[PDB]
């Protein structure tokens, strides 16, 4: 909050603008990275209520209805195992929506094979 410091800082020009623009580019790049990785389907698929897959069990990878976060047991374990002008911008996609995208991908690859990735 020193005004004399800012008056002296104005002599150096637009360095601060370049730093802010570079950080803004990185921040939008992270959201673009998440968008490219997880949002590869525009249809939100769901598994059937009856899990009759010919003996194949997907309970450890399908979302758990008992959990409020709607995550899989494996995803829940993964989330448990990860632990002055500065601001942290939140990600555009929340963890619930990323979990929803993974659930849609799992439902598509279980119920429809590779057909959902190439069309209907």
């Amino acid at each position: 909050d020193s005004t004399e410091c800012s008056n002296l800082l104005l002599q150096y020009g637009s360095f601060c603008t370049q730093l802010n623009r570079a950080l803004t580019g990185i921040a939008v790049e992270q959201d673009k990275n998440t968008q490219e990785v997880f949002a590869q389907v525009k249809q939100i698929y769901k598994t059937p209520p009856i899990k009759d897959f010919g003996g194949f069990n997907f309970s450890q990878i399908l979302p758990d209805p008992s959990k409020p976060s709607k995550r899989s047991p494996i995803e829940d374990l993964l989330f448990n195992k990860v632990t002055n002008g500065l601001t942290v911008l939140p990600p555009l996609l929340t963890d619930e929506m990323i979990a929803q995208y993974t659930s849609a991908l799992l439902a598509g690859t279980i119920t429809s094979g590779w057909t959902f990735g190439a069309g209907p």
Binding site: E4, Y12, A22, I26, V82, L105, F116
Partner: protein, 99 residues
């Protein structure tokens, strides 16, 4: 150590932010690292010089932080492009590519 790859990214980002905070405590050759002490102890002709030294030190620290953040952003972008490729080719189809 199963999830070391994500933990490394989190630790690197937190450590870079902590280093950027700790660079404020360095005087960079000035009499003090606090702007208030310089502005209260000295007249503006010499406080201008001391504040200028603090400004150039902190600006160099911030440029270093932004440069290493850009390099790490390039690395994370490459990893994310690889992850998107694996999402398209391993999950949405069956891949003949070995390993």
């Amino acid at each position: 150590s199963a999830l070391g790859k994500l933990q490394d990214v989190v630790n690197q980002n937190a450590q870079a932010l902590n280093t950027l905070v700790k660079q404020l405590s360095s005087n960079f050759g000035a009499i003090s690292s606090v702007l208030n002490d310089i502005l209260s102890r000295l007249d503006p002709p010499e406080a201008e010089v001391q504040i200028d030294r603090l400004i150039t030190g902190r600006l160099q620290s911030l440029q270093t932080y932004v440069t290493q953040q850009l390099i790490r952003a390039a690395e994370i972008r490459a990893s994310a492009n690889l992850a998107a490729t694996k999402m398209s080719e391993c999950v949405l189809g069956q891949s003949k590519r070995v390993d």
